[PDB]
Each structure stands twice: as structure tokens, then as C-alpha cells.
Design a protein around this ligand. Sequence first.
Ligand code: CLA
Ligand code: CLA
Ligand code: CLA
Ligand code: CLA
Ligand code: CLA
Ligand code: CLA
Ligand SMILES: CC1=CCCC(C)(C)[C@H]1/C=C/C(C)=C/C=C/C(C)=C/C=C/C=C(C)/C=C/C=C(C)/C=C/C1=C(C)CCCC1(C)C
Ligand SMILES: CC1=CCCC(C)(C)[C@H]1/C=C/C(C)=C/C=C/C(C)=C/C=C/C=C(C)/C=C/C=C(C)/C=C/C1=C(C)CCCC1(C)C
Lengths: 160, 30, 137, 42, 92, 80, 33, 731, 61
Amino acid sequence: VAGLTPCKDSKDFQRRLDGSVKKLKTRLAKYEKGTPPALALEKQIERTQARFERYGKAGLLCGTDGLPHLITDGRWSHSGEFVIPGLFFLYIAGWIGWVGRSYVLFARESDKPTEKEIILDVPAALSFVSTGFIWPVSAFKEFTSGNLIADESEITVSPR
Amino acid sequence: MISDTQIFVALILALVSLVLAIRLGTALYQ
Amino acid sequence: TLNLQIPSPTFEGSTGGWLRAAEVEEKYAITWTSGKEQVFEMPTGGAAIMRKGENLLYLARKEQCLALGTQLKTGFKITDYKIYRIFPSGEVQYLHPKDGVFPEKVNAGRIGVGNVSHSIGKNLNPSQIKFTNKSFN
Amino acid sequence: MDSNFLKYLSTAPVLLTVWLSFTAGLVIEANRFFPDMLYFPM
Amino acid sequence: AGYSPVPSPDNTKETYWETKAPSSQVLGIGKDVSSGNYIVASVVAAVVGAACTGQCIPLTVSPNPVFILGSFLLPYSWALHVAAWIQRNNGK
Amino acid sequence: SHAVKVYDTCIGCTQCVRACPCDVLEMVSWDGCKAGQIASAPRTEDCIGCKRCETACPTDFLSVRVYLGGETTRSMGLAY
Amino acid sequence: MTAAYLPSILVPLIGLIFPGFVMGFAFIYIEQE
Amino acid sequence: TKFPKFSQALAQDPATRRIWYGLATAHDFESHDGMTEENLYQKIFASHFGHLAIIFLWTSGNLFHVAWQGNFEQWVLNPLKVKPVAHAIWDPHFGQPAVKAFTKGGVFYPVNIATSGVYHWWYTIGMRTNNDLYAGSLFLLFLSGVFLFAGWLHLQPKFRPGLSWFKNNESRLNHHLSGLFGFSSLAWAGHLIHIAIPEARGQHVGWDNFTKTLPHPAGLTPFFTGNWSLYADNPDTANHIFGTSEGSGSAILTFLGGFHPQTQALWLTDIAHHHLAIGVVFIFAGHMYRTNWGIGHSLKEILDAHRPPGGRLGAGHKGLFETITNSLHFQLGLALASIGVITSLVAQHMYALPAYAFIAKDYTTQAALYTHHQYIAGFLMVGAFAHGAIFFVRDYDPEQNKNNVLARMLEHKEAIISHLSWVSLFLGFHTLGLYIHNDVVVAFGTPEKQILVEPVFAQWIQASSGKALYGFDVLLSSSNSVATNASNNIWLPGWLDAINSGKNSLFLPIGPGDFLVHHAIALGLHTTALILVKGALDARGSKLMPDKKDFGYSFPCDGPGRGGTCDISAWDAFYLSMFWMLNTIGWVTFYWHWKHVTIWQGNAGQFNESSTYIMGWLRDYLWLNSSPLINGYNPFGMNSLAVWAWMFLFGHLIWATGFMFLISWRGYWQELIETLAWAHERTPLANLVRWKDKPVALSIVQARLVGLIHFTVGYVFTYAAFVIASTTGKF
Amino acid sequence: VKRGSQVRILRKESYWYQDVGTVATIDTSGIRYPVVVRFEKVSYSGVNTNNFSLDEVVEVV
Ligand code: CLA
Ligand code: CLA
Ligand code: CLA
Ligand code: CLA
Ligand code: CLA
Ligand code: CLA
Ligand SMILES: CC1=CCCC(C)(C)[C@H]1/C=C/C(C)=C/C=C/C(C)=C/C=C/C=C(C)/C=C/C=C(C)/C=C/C1=C(C)CCCC1(C)C
Ligand SMILES: CC1=CCCC(C)(C)[C@H]1/C=C/C(C)=C/C=C/C(C)=C/C=C/C=C(C)/C=C/C=C(C)/C=C/C1=C(C)CCCC1(C)C
């Protein structure tokens, strides 16, 4: 609706579905019924039909090409297209980074940090992996306590 | 449409510009 | 001084030896005493047999002469190798064991050339030495 | 189990291979049971 | 260090400031104008420029030259009020 | 020729002198380092620019620096 | 003598004579003491 | 030797490096022996005179060849049917088939067809006969002579300028804004009113007629009465045949907007009004700075005064006056960056808004011009950053720039570089990932699984400008908006007519393929900027070589110590950015050319559908459009495109040759040339001849430069062939 | 500063500039760069030790 048409009611989308199904059926016509190839092609047809129907009902918009297009501007009617998926990413990525940083510090305060970085201490690594589930509040706590950002006078820098 | 006399006037102006370019090249080479 | 009558290490010949530039510009020489007849590697390529006694060898480059000297010093235990440079005029000069002692050990008499009285961080900037004769030192 | 063998299994390439194989299996099974998810359903 | 001296126009003064406000030499010909004068000028310029702009927003093919001229007072009023603040914190 | 220079940071390790394929660096006497010796570059006209001296230097920033300058037969290592 | 002859008169000059003379003179200049 | 007379260090080199480096350092005056600042500036002045003379001679040659061997007079009759010929071909290598294949201009001799658009340009200006072009060429020859004489004269002892004159910023700025820009554009408006518009209306006006021919029936009374609107009354009708009096008006200054219907270019009256307006604006701007009188500003005062009291910039702009005035490299970088931006703008605006008559229908000309100016833009930007780095190495004075914006840039260079690197990785990772996702799904036969993001932001900007294709109703798409109501009676009618017709390139419709290629362009710009900025900021020193300013700008390396220091120079950063700049301009021009080709053939759906995966570009753009080019010559004959096919292969060859210098490095070649010298000296009958310069291998920096040059020439020639030949073979 | 003390480097050209090391020895003979600092981080050249002056090192807390 933004600048395109709903995909549930687009002749282009219907034509693409028809073409895919017809290709699969032409491939199926040369195989005996009940044979593994026939069953596989039938399952492919079912998967194609389910995918197209679900895309139609999802509320996705489709252009003249007959393919779904994504509205990644912030509109709440299309949040599931970029924003919620991206929030899940950011959660997982902050988890990974936070636990990795924690393990780096843990290995830093060890007898052999390099040995701990090549041959890992997987009990402690799994500990940190577990901790990573509240990484947003933990990272902000580190920031505000001053344990995250290092001072300008304590970081090596090249001469000007 | 462009006559030989016209082409010759153009060539003469080109020669003058070449002389001046040689002069400038000398003065720059110094 | 250099004695041009010292025999040579009975080399069989190579295409890595000196060329016309040796006869025109500079030709280096190395002399060393050997206690026995060993087989060494020429800096130009190939094997040669050094003689029992003094051996003189001609090369095109001081680096070749010094590589041969390093081979003698490390592989063998010969450290009396002297290096000379010869010009077409016959101006043979003396270079290695310059003062008779190798440079790796301090010796009284040398004068420091190229020494600076600060760390590299104290060098001036090209903007400061631009359109001037000052040195970045 | 031998502690030396366990340290070998704790070495970086073994852990990276096992962890990324586990992650690949996770993604593959997610796509096997919930395929063609071009969007979060809302 | 061997660079030739940089020529600058006549009567070039030092305008660098780390004080609360510049030195009023920044205002040039208007350095001796009062802060109240700058305030009144800024208000009058803003009002006149806004009025002359509104008289020209649906621009016709024959706009009034005086309205065009006066519309340039809205941008002028900004500099005038900046000068007012500068001149209030420099003693005037 | 290349310009080879030594600085106060020298510690007299002599590895710069021993690493030189030519004979450009020699040890001289000094009082600024425990070893009492400093590197010097008298035969800079034989320098080739390999920077082996620079490689064999243990001080944070090198005490010996080679600034590659004009090229000659000896600097270019031309046996011809 | 018309202008149509000028291409055939000049292209060989500009493309074989001018480059040859320039190369010879520049050779003499660059290798000269 | 005395070839590199400006360097004894090179004159005493016994090898071929002397010749090579004398070539490559001839114009680095600062590094020359005994170079003073006065001599530097005066030599630069004379060289500028010579460069202007060269440009004038080049344009004069263009005009002369179009006048002599051109078909301008028979092109001004049916410009949409006749191909414009650049110059005749005289090659003694052509066969009869080639001569016949190149006699396409209806001229009875082999010719080249111009792709520069000079025909359309001159026709719009007012040139109609070959005598006009010949007179222009004569004048430009005279001007080249005048400027050569000026260059020679200003090197004379009593005419050599002084440094107090060269460093006079205010007078030069005033004169360049007022006279060079302002009065020059005012004079262009004068030309457009006295010659171009009458010529476009069929009334010849020249040196013998312009002093008796009124540009307007009212004369100058409407000007000297304040009734300026009389100069916009009666514009040219929509049925005006350019160059004839049918449909013409009498207006000389207008703001109709949009494009002339028949010519499909901007109104000449609009252009004249544009130039007059910017002329008066520039004349006013050129009265800002102080000169021999009391009025005006001083740039030093302004720069020093501009420091935010919050202190977030430190000393603000203190010392920048001296820095810029004393550093020619700072000025060079600023000029190069600005000219690069402006030439990119020229490319963009000149296609979206054509100004010359019938140029839009010359498809090969438009593509050639766009590619030309984009490549020039990229070169200029790379040069601007390179000279910024050179300034940092050579002309930067920290004590002078004590805690001003420049010293602060140097202070947080690490933050700048790291964040630029992060944004580069961000863009690259995700753009390439989306492209690969689309590729894999389309390959598996599920194009409906592609991630296609609508460029809603750019579509919104288009709609704000007045495009109704996308339903947004924002500012000018909205009929009740204040923006619409403000300009409804000046330019909006024509502008909307232009924006909302699909017959032009003004604000082309965009889609997910455009989105993806735009983010590829963002990646390219950001990575080129990353390399260049890192080079500039680390030019003075890094943690690996903390004394780089001592070694300069373009040293080879620092040896294999400290892990290896290959390509540790700011010149190397330039060398590495140049690869990326070429990549990015290649992406930009690929995008432009494919979109416009598809639109021109009317199958824009092909781009809309295939632009979303890289196989689409490889198949439907390169493979599909290379057919006529690669068939320029074949076992069954040849056509005029044979030259472009040959140059296509030529570019491939030189590109791959540059790969040699870029992958193979010096030591191998030096140990090979040693054996070659041995063989020559040892060969009878050839040892009678000897080299005067010892044959040596190429230097490290020299090899990098030669490989880069070969790579660049191949890049440019290959794409120039492809674009011109494919456009000419498809249309 | 004394032996076995943490000192932050203040030499700009140093690989360990604004980084902390441990003083191993301080020579009172009167040489240019008496203090000797060991570091856990190796430099590009592979050395984890250096000689510094008393003005290029500051004790940390
Ligand atoms: C751009 C300039 C240019 C010009 C004007 C020419 C002209 C010519 N080339 Mg071409 N050529 C050029 C560049 C040029 N070439 C380049 C850059 C290359 C390198 C790829 C070649 C490689 C090349 C080859 C391999 C051949 C030609 C040949 C030819 C001839 C054309 C065919 C024919 O029937 O003539 C042939 C008929 C003749 C009667 C030839 C007479 C030529 C007279 C003697 C020339 C006078 C030379 C002059 C005295 C030398 C002055 C030296 C001074 C500058 C120092 C003609 C002489 C063909 C040929 O036969 O050349 C001899 C030929 O086989 N050319
Ligand atoms: C008008 C602008 C301008 C000006 C005045 C200068 C001026 C200068 N530049 Mg340059 N520069 C510019 C633009 C400009 N640059 C641009 C746009 C770039 C980016 C590409 C550069 C990149 C650049 C670098 C990286 C360097 C300079 C350097 C210099 C200085 C020395 C010039 C030199 O060595 O000559 C060179 C002389 C030549 C004859 C050039 C030879 C190579 C060219 C490119 C020809 C190759 C094309 C080939 C012949 C075509 C074949 C055709 C085919 C069909 C066969 C000098 C102050 C150097 C310097 O001194 O820095 C401190 C330096 O290192 N510049
Ligand atoms: C299936 C889809 C998919 C895939 C395969 C990837 C893959 C990738 N993404 Mg991700 N990304 C996705 C979807 C996806 N993305 C979506 C939908 C979004 C929109 C929200 C993003 C937004 C995103 C960002 C913002 C970044 C990436 C980055 C990356 C790359 C490195 C991630 C990493 O190292 O994590 C391991 C985690 C870490 C190393 C920790 C540090 C980095 C994370 C991302 C910080 C997260 C928390 C932080 C507070 C967020 C601030 C963001 C703000 C500054 C904008 C990797 C190639 C990173 C990249 O390209 O860097 C060059 C990166 O910075 N992605
Ligand atoms: C710079 C512009 C320019 C260019 C690129 C060309 C190109 C050409 N001209 Mg020339 N030409 C020019 C200006 C130019 N012309 C001018 C201004 C005139 C009028 C005097 C002529 C008159 C002319 C004639 C009469 C003929 C050519 C021909 C040709 C062709 C072969 C070269 C030749 O014989 O030159 C010969 C040129 C001259 C005798 C005089 C003009 C020389 C110009 C002014 C040199 C300018 C040099 C430039 C500014 C700086 C050099 C840069 C440096 C790095 C090399 C070729 C297409 C010939 C051909 O076969 O055409 C199909 C031919 O018959 N031209
Ligand atoms: C297609 C060729 C190519 C590619 C992919 C890259 C990639 C990169 N270059 Mg570039 N570069 C190239 C050619 C290329 N370059 C060339 C020819 C040159 C001239 C010498 C340069 C010179 C150059 C310089 C000088 C710089 C870059 C930089 C970059 C980065 C840009 C940011 C980016 O896109 O991050 C996104 C990353 C990618 C697109 C690559 C990821 C590849 C895959 C998709 C990731 C997944 C790996 C996979 C799981 C492995 C499985 C295989 C395994 C089993 C063996 C990135 C690493 C800059 C940089 O490092 O900035 C951070 C930089 O400074 N490049
Ligand atoms: C297309 C790319 C290209 C080209 C042209 C070459 C060319 C060459 N390479 Mg190779 N090389 C390449 C890529 C290329 N390389 C790459 C990418 C690498 C990196 C891996 C290398 C690495 C490499 C090595 C390590 C070696 C070579 C060698 C050679 C030489 C082989 C024998 C020879 O001289 O043939 C001569 C033939 C040609 C150069 C073909 C083009 C010449 C045409 C046919 C004639 C044109 C002349 C024309 C008339 C001139 C007119 C000028 C003017 C009038 C316009 C030759 C110079 C070997 C060598 O030198 O051994 C002898 C060698 O040791 N190359
Ligand atoms: C035509 C005619 C009519 C009747 C009488 C006459 C005998 C004269 C007869 C013959 C005339 C003849 C033979 C004319 C010849 C014409 C010629 C030689 C034309 C060539 C002109 C060349 C020109 C411009 C070249 C310009 C080059 C320039 C700027 C180069 C710039 C520079 C460069 C490249 C390096 C640094 C120095 C400088 C100068 C800045
Ligand atoms: C006016 C208008 C119309 C339509 C709506 C819109 C919102 C667009 C509105 C506003 C438009 C605006 C604000 C446009 C902005 C464009 C801008 C800011 C363009 C600037 C581009 C900057 C460039 C290349 C910078 C290149 C920098 C270079 C080489 C630097 C080199 C240097 C280095 C590396 C070392 C020091 C010396 C030096 C020479 C400085």
C-alpha cells in the first residue's frame, strides 16, 4: 500500500506461483507414482504452495515483478520485516561480544593468557556464555562504573 | 566549405603559438 | 699492503665472476691463510679448494668478499682474511680489518661518524627544515 | 578421560569447528521445521 | 620556518578569544554600537523581514523590489542578535 | 649514498655491526651506555640499504636508522 | 595543392618523423655529460 | 650526466633509474636542488599559463576538425537523424573494407563519430555554420598565444611576481568571485541573450549584426525602468522548432522550468536568467574581503575568531590562515576535492537535466559524458586526499597548529580510522550478504525468497520534489502544500510536467536493485575514504614506523624488520585507494549504463528484476550487451565497431600486464637482468655495443606506479570501448 | 621509581607509549637511559625489554 500492492492480491505473484508449480509438475510427469522422485517432487510442490500462501497472508507487499518487497523505514506495520529481526540480531550479537570480552579479561588475569586463548578453559567459557543473557544491563553497568571505557592517557597511540 | 586560405591562416597562428610555446619552455627550463 | 703473487684457490671457473666493470671501475680482493686444503663455496657460485697457506681471490663486490670472509670465519675457523679494493690505476686500498681488528669489538683510535645526541623522537619536522639548510637532526 | 585429551579437545580449532557445526545444525533445523521465513510473523 | 611572511589586509587585529564573548573587534564597523541598539535592530529586522517575506511567499512574476530587499532582514536579524549577545557580555 | 645514523639510544649490543653484509658500522667508545661502546658509520659509502642493521637492533625505536638516498654502483650492489 | 592532401602529407610526419627526431634528440640529451 | 638537472643525486646515478626518476620527479619543484619559494611560485605561475594555453589549443583543434572534416552544417538540419563526425581517419593500415565501414557519415571518406556532444553544445550556443567554428578556433589559437606570451613574460626579471603578491588571499578571492566567476557568468548571460536565443529563433546575430539587433523589442527600457517582468513575457511556445522562428517568443529571461518540448533540454531563457542571477550573486560575494580600501573582512580575523566557547574544538581555527597560505598542498587538496565534487555534480545534473538540444536522444554521447566525468571526479578526489597526505608529511607545523581542528584530527585519528573501518565492514558484509542471498535463492528457483528493500527514503525525496509515481503526497506531490502553493505560478507547472513524464531521466523510478547498488556505492566511497584518510593521518607516523615524516611521502618501505613493512607509505595508500576508486567508479558507471540502456530499450523490468543478484549483472548487462562489440570484427566481416573491439582487447591486455608489475617484485627481475647483462657482455658481435646506463630492474615504487598505470589504462579503455560500442550497436 | 615498580611509558616513539611495564633495574652510573623496563606485550621487533630515562616513565598507582 505504501507504494506497492499487497502480495495476496497480485496477478504477478499468482503467475509466479503458477510457473513454479507447473515446472515442478512437468518434472513430476516423467516419474512413476509412489516412487521416491514422485514423492520428493510432490513435497516440493506442497512446500512451494505453502510458502506462497504464507507470504500472501503475511501482509507482504509485492511490486510489478511479482516479488515481495520490504519497507525498512520504521513503519510499525512492517516491523517484522527489518526491526524485530534486527532486534533479535542485536541481542545475539551483544551476547556474543559481551561473553567474548569477559573471557578476554578472565584470560588476561591468568598464569598464561596466551595458553588460555589457544587452549580454552571451557568451564569458564561456558560460565560467560551463560552470563551473556543480560548483556545490555551488564554492559551499561560496566560503562557507568567506568570498567568499560579506558582513559585516553592509558591507551597506546602512535606519534603525530 | 573551409578554404585552403583559411586552413593556412590557422596554420600560421599555430606556428606563432608554437614559437611562443618554445619560448615559454625555455624560460621555464631555466 | 697486498701481494699480487699469492696463489688462488684452484677454482674451476664460473660465469658468476667479475666482468668489465671490474676492469673499469673497481675490483675487490680477499687474502687469507688456511691450515689445510678444504673445500669452500664461492660467493659467485660453485665449489673451490683453498690451498695450504695463503690464498688470494678476486671478486666484483665488497659484499661478495665479506660473505666469503664470514663463511671462512664461521664454517671454518679462518679469521685472518683481509679485503682490498683495486682501481684500474693500481691504487690497491685496504678495507676490512681496517685497523687490524674487526669492527664488532671496540678499539682505541676510532672516531664516531653519524652519531646523534638524542632519540629519534627529537628529530625536527620537514616543515621546520623547509626552505632552510637545517638538518632534521 | 585423559586430561591431555580433554585439553586437546579444548584447543581453539576443535572448539571452533564443534561450535560452528552446532550453530550450523541449529540454523539448518530451524529452516527445516520453519522454512521460507523471510520475515518475523506479526 | 623559511616560509615567507603571510600578507594580511591593513588594520588586521587579533580576534582570537577564549573569554565568554569575543572582543567586539569581531563586529567591525558596528563595534561601538550599543547592545540595546543591536536588540532593537534585531527585533525590527526580524519583524520587517518576516512581513516582507510573507508578502512574497506566493511569488508572482512581478515581485516588489522593496519587499525583496526587506526580506533580507530576517537573515540580518540573526547576526544582529548574535552581535547583541556579544555586546552585552563585553561590557555594553 | 644512503645516510646511516646512530642515536643516544645505542646500548652497544654490537649486533648492528655484526649483521652488516658490508663493513659500514663499527664500534667506538662511549660513556652513555653500560657497555661503554656506541655504533658509528664511517664507511657509509659502501652501504647498500638492506637495513639488516635495523633488523638487528633491540631498542624500542631503533638506535640505527638507514635513510635511503642517492643511488650509486655500490649502493645498488651492481657487480657489473 | 588542396587541403585534402594535408592528412597524407602530415600523418607520416607527425607519426614517424616527429617521434623519430624527438627520440633521437632526447636520447642525445639524456645520455650526455 | 645532466638530464635530471634538478637533482645531482639522479644526475650521478649510473643506471636507467636516473632517466626514470628524472621523468617522474620533473614537476616536484619543492624537492628540486636549490629551490626557493619565490622561484617555486613563479615557475608554478608560468606552468599555469602554459596549461591554459594547452587547453585553449585542444579546444581549438576540436573546433577546427569539426569545421574542416565535420558535418555540422548538415547536422544542424536534422540533428536527430545525422550522426556527428569528430574528424576524418587517415590510417595507411586500413583495408578497403575498413575504409568503407568507416564511411558512415555520408561524407565520402572514413570518419570518427563524435561522442563528446560538442555538436549539440555548439548548436545550443548559436553556432550554425562552419565559419563560426573556424572563427572560434582562430580566436582560441590567438588566446593560446596570448597566454603563452603571458607565461613567458611573467618569468622576466621585472615582471616576475613576488610572494607578497602570490600570498595575497583577499584580492585574489575578490577578483575570482567577482570577475572570473561572477562577471564571466554575466557575460555568458549576455551571449545567451544576444546570440544564442535569436539563433535558436532563426535570427542570425553576429559581430556584424549584434550592435544593431535588439535582443528584445523593448530594448533596455524595461531594465532601466524597474519593469523587469517585461523580459519574461511571451516565452517560446511548446511548438517551437529550435533554430527556426516557428513558435518562438520574445522573452529573454524566464523561469518556465522543465524542458523544452522539442529539444527536450532546459529553456535557453531559463539558462540565461540562471547565469545572470549567479553572476550578480558572485559579484556581490566578491566584495566581501578587504583590499586597498577599508571595507571588507580579513580571513585571518575570521578564522581566529571562530572558536566555539564550549571548547569542543579547542583553539578552533587559529593558525589555519598561515597553514593554508604557506602550504600549496593544502590548497591543492582543497581545490581538487571541490573540483571533484563539482564534476560529479556535473555528471549527475547533466543527465537528469540536459541543457543542450537533442543531447538526450544521443544515447552513446550521454553515456560517454557521464562515464568521463565520473572517472575524472574519482581521479580528482584521490588526488585531493593524496595532496592532503603530502601536506601532512611536508607542510604541517604542529607548533603552529597547537590544538586547533587539524591537530585534533591528528589527535583522534585512531577513532576516525577505526570507525571508518567499522562502517566499511558493516556495509560490505551486509550488502554482499544480501546479494549472495538473492543469488542463492534465485539459483534454487525461489526468487520470492529474495530480500528486496524498497528505497523508500529516495522515493520520498522524489515525491517531495513532485513525483506522483509513489503514493506519498508530501510537499510537491501534495497539491494543497505550502511548498506547492508558493511556486505554483513560477516554475512548478513545467517542473511537474518534467518530473512526472517517463520520457526523461529526471528522477528515474528506483527500486530494490537501485537500493542494493546504492549501498554498494556507499561501501566503495567509504572504503576509498578509509584508505585515503588512513594514509593521510598515518603519513607522519605510526607505531610501526614512528618516524615516517623523516622518510617522506613515497619511500619504498622500511625493510623486513618489525614483521615486514611493505606498503607503509602514504603513497602506497594512494596506490591502494586508486584500485578502490576504480572499483567504485566502475560500480557507479555500470549502474548508470545498465539502468539507462534498459530504459532506452523500454525493458526497464529487466533491470528491475535482474539487478537484485550478481548473476543478473553478469548475464543481462555484460554478457548480453557485449555481443555487438565482440562482433565488431569476426571471421565473416567487420564493421565500424571493429576499432572498439580492438580497444576492448587492448584494455584487457594492458590490465593483465599491470598485474605483472603488481604481483612480481624486484629481486627476481634484478637477478634476471644480471644474467642478461652477462650474456650481452659475453656475446661476440654484440659486445661491440655497450650500454651507457647500467641496465637495472625497476624500483619498488616505480614498479607499483607502472603496474597501477597499466591497470588504470586497461580499466578505462576496456570500459570506454564497452560503453560506446554497446550503446552504438544497441541503438 | 625503584626496582619492581609499575611505570607507564611517556616516550612517543615507543611501542609501549602510555603502557605499563615493570622496572627491572635502575643504573646509577650516570648513563643516558638508566632505567630498564620489562613488558608483557612484545614489540614488533620481538623484544619485551627496553632502556628508558627517568623523565620518560611515570609511576602508576
Ligand atoms: C602513426 C604513424 C605511422 C605511419 C604513418 C605508418 C606508416 C606505415 N606503416 Mg606502420 N606502424 C606504426 C605507425 C605508423 N605506420 C606503428 C606505431 C607500428 C608498430 C606496431 C607500425 C608497424 C608497421 C608494420 C609492421 C608495417 C607497417 C607498414 C606501414 C606502411 C603502410 C602499408 C604500406 O603499404 O606501406 C608499405 C609500402 C612502402 C613503399 C613503404 C615505404 C616506407 C618508406 C621507406 C618510409 C620512409 C622512412 C624514413 C626515411 C625514416 C626516417 C627516420 C627518422 C625518423 C629517424 C606505412 C609506411 C608496413 C610496411 O610495409 O612498412 C614498411 C608494415 O609491414 N607499420
Ligand atoms: C592540478 C592538480 C595537480 C597538481 C598541480 C599536482 C602536482 C603535483 N603532484 Mg599530483 N596529483 C594530482 C593532481 C595534481 N598534482 C591528482 C589528481 C592525483 C591523483 C591521481 C595526484 C597524485 C599525486 C601523487 C600520488 C603524487 C603527486 C605528486 C605531485 C607533485 C609532483 C608531480 C610529479 O611527480 O609529476 C609526475 C610527472 C609525470 C610525467 C607523470 C607521469 C605519469 C602520468 C600519470 C602519465 C600516465 C599516463 C600514460 C602516459 C597514458 C598512456 C596512453 C595509452 C593510450 C598508451 C606535484 C606538486 C608527487 C609528489 O611530489 O608528492 C610529494 C606524488 O607523489 N600527485
Ligand atoms: C541472518 C542475517 C545476518 C547475518 C548473517 C549477519 C552477519 C553479521 N552482522 Mg549483522 N545484522 C543483521 C542481520 C545479520 N547480520 C540485521 C538484521 C541487522 C540490523 C539490526 C544487523 C546489524 C548489524 C550490525 C550493527 C553489525 C552487524 C555485524 C555483522 C557481522 C559481524 C557480527 C559479529 O561479529 O557478531 C559478534 C559480535 C561482536 C563482535 C560484538 C560487537 C558487534 C555487535 C554487532 C554489537 C552489538 C551491540 C551494540 C550495542 C549495537 C550498537 C549498534 C549501533 C552502533 C548501530 C556479521 C557478518 C557487525 C559488522 O558488520 O561489523 C563490521 C556489526 O557491527 N550486523
Ligand atoms: C590539440 C589539438 C589537436 C589535436 C588533438 C589534433 C589531432 C589531429 N590533427 Mg590536428 N590540428 C589542430 C589541433 C589538433 N589536431 C589545429 C589547431 C589545427 C589548425 C592549425 C590542426 C590542423 C590539422 C591538419 C591540417 C591536419 C591535422 C591532422 C590531425 C590528425 C593527425 C595529427 C597531425 O597531423 O597533426 C598535424 C597538426 C599540425 C600540423 C598543426 C596543429 C598542431 C597542434 C596545434 C599541436 C597542439 C599540441 C597540444 C596543445 C599540446 C601537446 C601535449 C604534449 C604532452 C604532447 C589528428 C586527428 C591531420 C589529419 O590527418 O587529420 C585527419 C591533418 O591533415 N590537424
Ligand atoms: C572482491 C575482492 C575484494 C574483497 C572481497 C575485499 C574485501 C575487503 N577490502 Mg579490499 N581490496 C581488493 C579486493 C577486495 N577487497 C583489492 C583488489 C585491493 C587492492 C590491493 C584491495 C585493497 C584494500 C584495502 C587497502 C583495504 C581493503 C579493505 C577491504 C574491506 C572492505 C570492507 C568490506 O567490504 O568488509 C566486508 C568483508 C568482505 C566483503 C569480505 C568477506 C568475505 C566472506 C563473504 C566472509 C565469510 C567467510 C567465510 C565464512 C569463509 C569460509 C571459507 C573457509 C572454509 C576457508 C574488506 C576486508 C579495507 C579494510 O580492511 O577495511 C576494514 C582496506 O583498508 N581492500
Ligand atoms: C598479459 C599480461 C602479461 C604480459 C604481456 C606479460 C609479459 C611477459 N611476462 Mg609475464 N607476468 C604476468 C602477466 C603478463 N606477462 C603476470 C600477471 C605475472 C605475475 C605472476 C607475470 C610474471 C612474470 C614472470 C615472473 C616472468 C614473466 C615473463 C614474461 C615475459 C615473457 C616472454 C616475453 O618477453 O614475451 C614477449 C611478448 C610479449 C611481451 C607480448 C606482447 C608483445 C606484442 C606481441 C608486441 C608489441 C610490440 C609493439 C610493436 C611495440 C610498439 C610500441 C609503440 C610503437 C606503440 C614477458 C615480458 C618472464 C620473462 O621475462 O622471461 C623472459 C618471467 O620471468 N612474467
Ligand atoms: C600555412 C602557410 C601559409 C603561407 C606561409 C607559410 C610559409 C607560413 C605557410 C606554412 C606554414 C607552416 C609550415 C606552419 C606550421 C605549423 C606548425 C609547425 C604548427 C604546430 C603548432 C604547435 C603548437 C601550437 C604546439 C603547442 C605546444 C604547447 C603549448 C606545449 C606546451 C608546453 C609543454 C608541452 C612542455 C613545457 C612547455 C610548454 C610550452 C608549456
Ligand atoms: C542545499 C540542499 C539542497 C537539497 C536538500 C539538501 C538536504 C541536500 C540541502 C543540503 C545539502 C548539503 C548540506 C550538502 C552537503 C554536502 C557536503 C558537506 C559535501 C562535502 C564533501 C566533502 C569532501 C569531498 C571532503 C573531502 C576532503 C578532503 C579531500 C580532505 C583533504 C585533506 C586532508 C586529507 C588532510 C588535510 C588537508 C586536506 C586538503 C583538508
